[PDB]
Amino acid sequence: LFGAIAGFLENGWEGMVDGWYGFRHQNAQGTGQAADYKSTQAAIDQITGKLNRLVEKTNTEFESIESEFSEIEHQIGNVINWTKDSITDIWTYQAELLVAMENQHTIDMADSEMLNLYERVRKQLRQNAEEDGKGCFEIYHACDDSCMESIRNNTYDHSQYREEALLNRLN
Amino acid sequence: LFGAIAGFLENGWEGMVDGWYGFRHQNAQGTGQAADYKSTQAAIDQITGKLNRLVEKTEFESIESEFSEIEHQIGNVINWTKDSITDIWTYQAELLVAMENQHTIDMADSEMLNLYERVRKQLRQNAEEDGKGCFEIYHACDDSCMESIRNNTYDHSQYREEALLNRLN
Amino acid sequence: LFGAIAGFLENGWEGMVDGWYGFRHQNAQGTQAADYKSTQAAIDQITGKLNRLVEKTNTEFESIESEFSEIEHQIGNVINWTKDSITDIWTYQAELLVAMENQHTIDMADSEMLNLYERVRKQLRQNAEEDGKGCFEIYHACDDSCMESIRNNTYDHSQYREEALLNRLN
Amino acid sequence: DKICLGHHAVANGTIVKTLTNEQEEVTNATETVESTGINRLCMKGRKHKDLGNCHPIGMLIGTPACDLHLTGMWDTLIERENAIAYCYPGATVNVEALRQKIMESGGINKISTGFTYGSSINSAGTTRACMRNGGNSFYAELKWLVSKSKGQNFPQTTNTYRNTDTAEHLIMWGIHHPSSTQEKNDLYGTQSLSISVGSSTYRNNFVPVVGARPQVNGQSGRIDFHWTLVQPGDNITFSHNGGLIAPSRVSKLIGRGLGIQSDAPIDNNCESKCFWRGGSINTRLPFQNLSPRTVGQCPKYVNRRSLMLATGMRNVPE
Amino acid sequence: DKICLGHHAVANGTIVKTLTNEQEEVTNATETVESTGINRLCMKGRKHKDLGNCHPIGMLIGTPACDLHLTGMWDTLIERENAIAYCYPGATVNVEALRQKIMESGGINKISTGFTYGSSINSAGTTRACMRNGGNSFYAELKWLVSKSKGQNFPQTTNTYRNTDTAEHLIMWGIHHPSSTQEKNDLYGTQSLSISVGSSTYRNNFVPVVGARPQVNGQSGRIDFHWTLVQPGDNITFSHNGGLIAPSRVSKLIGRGLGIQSDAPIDNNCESKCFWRGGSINTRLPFQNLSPRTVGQCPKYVNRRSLMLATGMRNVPEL
Amino acid sequence: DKICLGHHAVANGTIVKTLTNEQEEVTNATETVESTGINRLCMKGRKHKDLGNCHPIGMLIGTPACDLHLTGMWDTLIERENAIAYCYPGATVNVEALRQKIMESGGINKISTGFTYGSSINSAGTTRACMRNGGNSFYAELKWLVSKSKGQNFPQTTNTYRNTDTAEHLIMWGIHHPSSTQEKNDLYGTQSLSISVGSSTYRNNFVPVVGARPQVNGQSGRIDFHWTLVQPGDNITFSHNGGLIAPSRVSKLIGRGLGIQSDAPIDNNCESKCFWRGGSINTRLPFQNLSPRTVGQCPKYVNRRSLMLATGMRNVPE
Ligand SMILES: *[C@@H]1O[C@H](CO)[C@@H](O[C@@H]2O[C@H](CO)[C@@H](O)[C@H](O)[C@H]2NC(C)=O)[C@H](O)[C@H]1NC(C)=O
Ligand SMILES: *[C@@H]1O[C@H](CO)[C@@H](O[C@@H]2O[C@H](CO)[C@@H](O)[C@H](O)[C@H]2NC(C)=O)[C@H](O)[C@H]1NC(C)=O
Ligand SMILES: *[C@@H]1O[C@H](CO)[C@@H](O[C@@H]2O[C@H](CO)[C@@H](O)[C@H](O)[C@H]2NC(C)=O)[C@H](O)[C@H]1NC(C)=O
Ligand SMILES: *[C@@H]1O[C@H](CO)[C@@H](O)[C@H](O)[C@H]1NC(C)=O
Ligand SMILES: *[C@@H]1O[C@H](CO)[C@@H](O)[C@H](O)[C@H]1NC(C)=O
């Protein structure tokens, strides 16, 4: 697990219904929302990849060894029942393991793509911002609507605002 | 693997007896040790989760007589099958324990890192990392204030101004 | 996925060959090495995976069906059903084993890559800044013996603190 | 000025199981175990044969119920619950092996034995137990041989069937066991009955036995059936005294097919690869809980009602 | 002024295996494979029957070792290693399928055939090989038919068992194979012997055969047994003239039970759901290495002494 | 002034499968499924017997093809494709179980039965179908007993083999089934023929049956073989009229060994523990796709051609 989704992010946003991961902002000219296509698509490719593996199964052909409609000799019938049940225990166990193991990795992978976005933004803002610890960045300069989009763009040039921010931070 | 356990933390604390994870502090008032409750319950819950899956429980009847002659060809078939089943279970069990052990070890690791990350972000600019799992605190932090850190009730802004100056000269 | 390989690092270093993880230089004089401890920890874990694989407590099996004559039809059909059932299981086992195993090997390579990065982040302390692409823009001088101080895990930050703080803050 | 980061959530979440947690809520999930099956045999694109009330054995000996299924070609063969193999009561040795061989076949052809019988013998024995156009009949590929005159000793008789084909053939005959000394005397005489059958690879002797018995289809005698495979270029000879139910045709199983035992009606406009007693199964899912006895190319049977696979993140509602 | 973060550790750790390291020190671990069984048969809660030295088949034909095991109800049936099936030597056809039916049953009732014989027949044939009160007896559910007048021809005889019940019955009979031509003549006469048996679903003929053989329980003759199931409302008829060892009673296997082969002593105080030869297994763990051949609701057998599940973090003590 | 962290890559990467990704490029991988096998039988360190054209049944019975294989000791017994069991036409009841028992063995010794026949019995009966050097012969371990004087009734005869050893012996005998009523009379007489065989744990009876049958190796008659294990301290008694093909020696199967059916050449340099029809399989890998039918200490057979296991990181080329 990464400390994010059931961790330092307090909860999820029920209102975000274009993305898996997103930004909310608040500058002086309003509050807005936006989803991040890159990281959500990263996580969805990994989901459809699992699902592919799950259905991407080709099968052996089996014939009947048990008569539906007539009596089978007692001893050979007992062997067949032991084998058949024993194979089923193996498959039932295998399916349970498959799903429990793959659900674990899925929950944690989603969490890693959540964190990987947070880290990207953090390294991007550089000395211009500080984090509270609920997943927010307190920015120490005037961030325009076109500046906000710049952070989401990965456009943002930290050097452009650095001095105003460093000044604001230190006092 | 997350960096903390058997990583940037150099060793464990045998002095810690009721917590998986915890704190040591040094200030004017002396030292102390505290275990963190939530982070260790977080680990212990996942352990007893694997234990519960483990012990979750088909009826089988006899197909080879113990006390008498079983026809040769059918007996070869039963031994072949039964040994084949045993190889599968033996492989399944070796795999289960090996994969779960790896995950257990790394989740433990994960829980240690998340505590450390929680504190780090909570100290904000009032502290720095030594790279050994310690935080050098650039103000005076009496016992009641060390505690507030273990509480998540520490307000960084309280000490910020004093801290930043202490960090610059 | 930790953030590094195929992550914030743009690509690998084909030119680097003496390890899996290294550094690249720049200063007065400067221009590549390799971390021994980090690429060993990684490699050590691949060879552990390899040993489990070639681990062979093989059970002795004999023939239950003849190659060179007709077996009785009903019991042959049970043998076929069983053998086929057993092979489906091992094909499933095998495929799952390496897909799961592969997932973990890749992601662990990522962990060791990151762990070195953060070890350096924490060393450099305040005397440097992360560029977001894997590098540490440094705000004092060093020196090519100082860089060796970074790699060798001996670097004293407070030795160069003042010098580099004023270079970041003015 | 703040920029914040977050994930989504939903009101109605889904519960899945993990390695550490049995009750874990996620944004989304899907089934991995199929529970719904088609109540039809999906036979489209298959050259199939629905036997109806003809038992596969009845194909070889030629029971009235099997008159529409004496010869044919198929890749899939369907046996039903009400299937008749015997009109005149009786049994077959190694019946399950034989039934399995028929149900793995891809068709049957028939070939005359060419057997012919002197005037002492009546080939045309019929019985009320096999009915055919309102009239008493008999198995279509066999002949009930008796003494033309009612009490006379059946003559010592020899018949040989020669397999001049390139493939092996499958030959069936019967042995009559009368229910009474009078029934026996009348059919074959008072003499001492015996039947040998020999070929390169088969050898056996049979003796009719009189015994009293309950009536089945109004008949108290029985006919036990025997079979063997006659190789290419090989011959099988019948030496007999009365009691032999003789083959007038032999069989040739051809190719390979998938045999199916089912309740379900046929749907020839539907495609499938997986079958069971209740019908068909068409699914992308790796597992299934409808039937532990399936046939064909099938998902694997698991003892669970459901196994939900997460396709979303942890659901943490506001 | 500083604050430090850390994890516990312990002095004496335990080793587990992981995917990448087979020697990994951890703070705790627990077994996943049972190694200790109870060497007793834990029959608590179970209405059981210990057959002692009675073999299952012997319950059907009434071997004297089985006199206290001719009827009963049970949910667990226990078979012991040298159990007696035959006093008079012989064999049963499809004995193993028959043993397994019995061992899967939840009881046995006995229904009388009501067979009755003419005065030229002696029904009460006995033999040194079946003893009761230390004197000559015979299988309790069967009767050794012989010519009452030594040497005379056994009358052509017919007997029909009718099942008027609502469930199938199990019928057993024997065919006697004498060891000498004189013995054969004495008992049944000089005629050709022949025994036919037919129901609606069963048909067979049988011919007694004379042959010299070793003595077994002091006897060179042999009784071979046969059996078949008789459906409700069906009748089964025996046509014979010497050699038939006739059923006087028929069995009905009732319900379902678990069958155990073991010589472990019964313990009526502990309960269990898993059994094998050397007793009982009682565990929460999903694997066991006690035995590859178990019975009931058992953990899966694995060829491994031990498998440790890490139940704690990497143990890292100080230098 | 900077320091930069990074990882290696390689020009040519290897594609693997993961949970989330088929077609994932990596800097290295190793195969987990063994697909290459040795065309030969690697017999190094193994004390072995190569039967050649001798069938295992023929070792007990003494078929002339098996003369150099009547006794011996082995690790490993190897059976070839068209091996001869019989010279005089016939077959064996429960032959596949019998064959398995011999291929599970570690060696055979032979023990004389000390059987002895009266003056009215010629026991050196031979046949054109069993050639040794130029001449008519017979199974080496059996004896064709016939009336010394053609057409006379074979005497009522008793022979008893006593196992005085501390281990079970395997005894085989034959029953002769003549081609013609004439052949029977010539060897045995006109009496009814009967053969009974009885130990403490076995009893059976055989009646020779005259029948017209095709000729196999120029012979219309047959000999059918029967067998059983005689326990220590037990005696087995043969009672007969003619038609018994009597054992002159019995067998003792000894220890345990590995039976291989293959048409591969032996190779004593190469070592191995796993065998199939086409040879040997020597590999570290836990999976193979060469053959689903193997014997020995084998890797598990899987359907896939390849399963690459990653041994490097993601390959990220510039
Ligand atoms: C089983 O036996 C009974 C009696 O022998 C048969 O039923 C009877 O039919 C006869 C003639 O119709 C009557 O004389 C009897 O009184 C009947 N018995 C009863 C109880 O009604 C019955 O047909 C036989 N079953 C079979 C399948 O043959
Ligand atoms: C099956 O019967 C045929 C016909 O009797 C046998 O073949 C004949 O073979 C012999 C010698 O091989 C020839 O001399 C005849 O000319 C053949 N007859 C015909 C019309 O083909 C054949 O040998 C028998 N099969 C066996 C195995 O006995
Ligand atoms: C097998 O035959 C031998 C001899 O025919 C039997 O053993 C003899 O055993 C009796 C009883 O102890 C002794 O009185 C004789 O002296 C023994 N004779 C010899 C020469 O050993 C033996 O009982 C028979 N075995 C079986 C199982 O019937
Ligand atoms: C729910 O999961 C299914 C299966 O992955 C998917 O088809 C569907 O898109 C998911 N729901 C939403 C709202 O995405
Ligand atoms: C060891 O682990 C077991 C099982 O989880 C537990 O019952 C016990 O409390 C643990 N104690 C130690 C550290 O020995």
Identify the CATH number of the domain in which residue A115 sits. 3.90.20.10
Tokens 């270079």, residue located: C167
Q: How far apart are CA F56 and CA F80, in angstroms?
A: 10
Q: How far apart are CA B106 and CA C168, in angstroms?
A: 37
Q: How far apart are CA D129 and CA D136, in angstroms?
A: 7
- Length of chain B equals 169
Q: How far apart are CA F45 and CA B29, in angstroms?
A: 77
Q: Which CATH architecture has domain F47-264?
A: Alpha-Beta Complex (3.90)
Q: How far apart are CA E165 and CA E231, in angstroms?
A: 9
DSSP per-residue letters across A57-77: -----B---S-SSSPPPHHHH
Other beta carbons within 10 Å of E156: 11
Q: How far apart are CA E8 and CA E313, in angstroms?
A: 9
Return the amino acid letter for D259: G
Q: How far apart are CA F109 and CA F123, in angstroms?
A: 23
Residue E273: DSSP 8-state: S
* E-state strands within chain A: 21-27, 30-35, 129-130, 136-139
The residues spanned by each domain of chain F are 1-46+265-318, 47-264
User: Which atom from ligand 4 is nearest to the alpha carbon of A48?
Assistant: 5
Output the CA torsion sign for D281, D286, D291, D297: positive
CA A151 from chain centre, in angstroms, equals 21
Q: How far apart are CA B98 and CA B84, in angstroms?
A: 21
DSSP per-residue letters across E214-243: --BTTB--EEEEEEEEE-TT-EEEEEESS-
Roughly how many angstroms between the first and final C-alpha of chain E, as a whole number? 25
- Ligand (nearest to CA of F89): 2
Q: Contact A131/D5 with Cβ under 8 angstroms?
A: no
In terms of DSSP bridges, do strands E266-267 and E41-42 run parallel, antiparallel, or are they unpaired?
parallel
SS3 of F125, please?
Answer: strand
In chain C, which residue's Cα lies nearest the Cα of D104? Answer: C77
In terms of DSSP bridges, do strands E90-92 and E222-230 run parallel, antiparallel, or are they unpaired?
parallel
- What is the CATH topology of the domain spanning D1-46+265-318? Hemagglutinin; Chain A, domain 2 (2.10.77)
Q: Contact D14/D26 with Cβ under 8 angstroms?
A: yes
Question: Residue F233 is encoded by which pair of tokens?
Answer: 């301290």
Which chain F residues contact residue D199 at CB under 8 A? 213-214
Using alpha carbons, select from C154, C114, C151, C106 the residue that is nearest to residue F6: C114
Tokens 């099988």, residue located: D236
Q: How far apart are CA F247 and CA F61, in angstroms?
A: 9
Other beta carbons within 10 Å of F60: 29
Name the domain count of chain A. 1
CA of F178 to the centre of ligand 2 (A): 20
Q: How far apart are CA D270 and CA D214, in angstroms?
A: 46
Q: Which resolution, in Å, applies to this structure?
A: 2.6
* CB-based burial label for B57 (10 Å; 0-12, 13-18, 19+): exposed
Q: How far apart are CA D177 and CA E57, in angstroms?
A: 31
SS3 of D184, please?
Answer: helix
Q: Which helix (H) or strand (E) holds A99?
A: helix A74-125
Q: How far apart are CA B87 and CA C29, in angstroms?
A: 62
Q: Which domain holds residue C38?
A: 1-170
Residues with CB under 6 A from ligand 3: E 214-215; F 162, 200, 233-235
Using alpha carbons, select from B145, F181, D8, C22 the residue that is nearest to residue A44: D8
Q: How far apart are CA F4 and CA C137, in angstroms?
A: 8
SS3 of B98, please?
Answer: helix
Q: How far apart are CA C120 and CA C131, in angstroms?
A: 13
Which among E194, E205, E234 is the nearest to D214, CB-wise? Answer: E234
Q: How far apart are CA E13 and CA D113, in angstroms?
A: 83
CA distance E97 to chain A (A): 5
In terms of DSSP bridges, do strands F76-79 and F48-50 run parallel, antiparallel, or are they unpaired?
parallel
Question: Residue D105 is encoded by which pair of tokens?
Answer: 């076949």
Q: How far apart are CA F5 and CA C118, in angstroms?
A: 10
Residue E209: DSSP 8-state: -
Q: How far apart are CA D83 and CA D71, in angstroms?
A: 17
Q: How far apart are CA B70 and CA F256, in angstroms?
A: 19
Q: How far apart are CA C160 and CA C155, in angstroms?
A: 10
Residue D154: DSSP 8-state: P
E143 — phi, psi (to 5°)?
-140, 130
CA angle in degrees (0–180, nearest 5) for A5-A37-A119? 45
D282: left (phi over 0), alpha (psi -120 to 50) or beta: beta
Q: How far apart are CA B147 and CA D283, in angstroms?
A: 59
Neighbours of C, requiring at least 3 CB pairs below 8 Å, are A, B, D, E, F
Q: How far apart are CA A141 and CA A161, in angstroms?
A: 7
Q: Contact F62/F139 with Cβ under 8 angstroms?
A: yes
CA of E235 to the centre of ligand 1 (A): 9
Return the amino acid letter for C74: Q
CATH entry, E1-46+265-319, from 2.60.40.1110, 1.10.760.10, 2.10.77.10, 1.10.1840.10: 2.10.77.10
In chain E, which residue's Cα lies nearest the Cα of C46? Answer: E20
Q: How far apart are CA C100 and CA C108, in angstroms?
A: 12
In terms of DSSP bridges, do strands D244-247 and D169-177 run parallel, antiparallel, or are they unpaired?
antiparallel
Q: Which helix (H) or strand (E) holds C138?
A: strand C135-138
Tokens 């026991």, residue located: F123
Which residue lies with its CA nearest to atom 25 of ligand 2? D234
C51 — phi, psi (to 5°)?
-65, -35
* E-state strands within D179-268: 195-198, 203-206, 222-230, 235-240, 244-247, 249-253, 258-261, 266-267
F20: left (phi over 0), alpha (psi -120 to 50) or beta: alpha
In terms of DSSP bridges, do strands D24-26 and D29-31 run parallel, antiparallel, or are they unpaired?
unpaired
Question: Residue C160 is encoded by which pair of tokens?
Answer: 């160069």
SS3 of D122, please?
Answer: strand
CA of B96 to the centre of ligand 4 (A): 30
Q: How far apart are CA C42 and CA C116, in angstroms?
A: 12
